[PDB]
Design a protein around this ligand. Structure first.
Ligand SMILES: [Mg+2]
Ligand SMILES: [Mg+2]
Lengths: 169, 170
């Protein structure tokens, strides 16, 4: 596994993240927000995003694993770590590094709705809408891209520490 | 409410860069596994690893208190154990704060059971005057007085983790 080319630079990422934060602040003027980051890959994006949000922010994490084929086709995942914070009647933004088929995030969506939040929006750094297997439109999207690593995203647990996003093989 | 800024955003960025250099020096030519103690160390970890040029693998651990027992013996309940293989690897455990050191001493024994090649501790903030056990962190960002702080991943009742600086609260 070797890196090929830089796809999105460190500076592009920082500018885009600042812009997404402004969009979020506008949509929730004067109100608290709960940010739920999907581990592990979104942790870098989440760390940068929340630091630009001036609203009172509560952050928590969720971890989910695959059941096998079932996950690839239906999005059914096993909750490994559920949320600790209260999102009932709250504004919730679920943060991902990537959304492609949307199957797993759709399943996570239903789980969060059981908690009865006031609002539930999705924020992803990268989006691949051509890979959708279900209806799921993210309200906040950093970049639409055409295997990648960096900025929290790995390849076999490697390269999460790159400050930029790159193509690999 | 927030009282005063204790460590600025810029001071944090400079210090984090410096800790990363110290880490690179100690592991010249080798891969490193970074294990961050959730939830408070996630911001520090995100910034620290981006300055480390070595091949880095990151994972997370979550531990909770059993009550008084934790405050006096460090005994904590592992809520989420590591997924990655640290056997024969260089491991750096990343914390936001080390005070009594009781809990990290307990986590140290847990990781040793995995037989890593090396195991070091890196904390953003250290309060050595609060030690109840012998534990010297190899990497320390700042020595702070025994006071309540928030920001840069650290909360007070789940509030203020999103401040880009560290502040006192009263
Ligand atoms: Mg993800
Ligand atoms: Mg901690």
């Amino acid at each position: 596994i070797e890196i090929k080319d830089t796809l999105i630079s460190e500076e592009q990422l920082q500018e885009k993240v600042k812009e997404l934060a402004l969009q979020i602040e506008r949509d929730f003027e004067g109100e608290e927000i709960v940010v739920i980051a999907v581990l592990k890959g979104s942790f870098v994006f989440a760390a940068d995003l929340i630091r630009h949000i001036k609203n009172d922010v509560t952050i928590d994490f969720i971890s989910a694993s695959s059941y096998g084929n079932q996950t690839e086709t239906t999005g059914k995942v096993k909750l490994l770590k559920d949320i600790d914070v209260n999102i009932t009647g709250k504004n919730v933004i679920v943060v991902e590094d990537i959304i492609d088929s949307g199957l797993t995030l759709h399943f996570l969506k239903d789980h969060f709705f059981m908690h009865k939040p006031k609002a539930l929006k999705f924020c992803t750094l990268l989006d691949k809408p051509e890979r959708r297997k279900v209806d799921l439109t993210a309200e906040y999207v950093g970049f639409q891209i055409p295997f990648i690593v960096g900025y929290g995203i790995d390849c076999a647990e490697k390269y999460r520490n790159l400050p930029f996003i790159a193509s690999v093989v």
